[PDB]
């Protein structure tokens with residue numbers, strides 16, 4: 732949509748897109764994560780996290796390492812640019828971020844930090 736994307740995380744851990752293109756015109760960008768299916772947060776929770784492609788592994792490891800209670804995102808982790816909370820089936824959440832935080836020509840990956848989910852739930856964000 733205009734400066735927004737509606738992305739989904741389903742019970743067979745996949746995202747409904749794998750490519751997000753944020754236009755330079757947008758001053759803010761909004762992602763609305765929604766979760767269809769019936770499998771609950773502790774078994775198939777999802778979240779939308781944004782970092783540079785280089786930082787990704789690290790955010791994922793230190794988030795995995797931090798636990799359900801901390802929604803698998805290490806607290807005040809400087810590498811995560813924007814993130815939603817972890818949601819189970821039937822939940823929704825959105826995050827708007829400053830597009831001026833995205834550097835032109837850098838590689839940004841979006842992903843889900845919940846254990847084992849990044850292997851299929853992750854894609855690219857490109858700021859044109």
Ligand SMILES: [Cu+2]
Nearest residue numbers: 776777843848
């Ligand atoms: Cu996930």
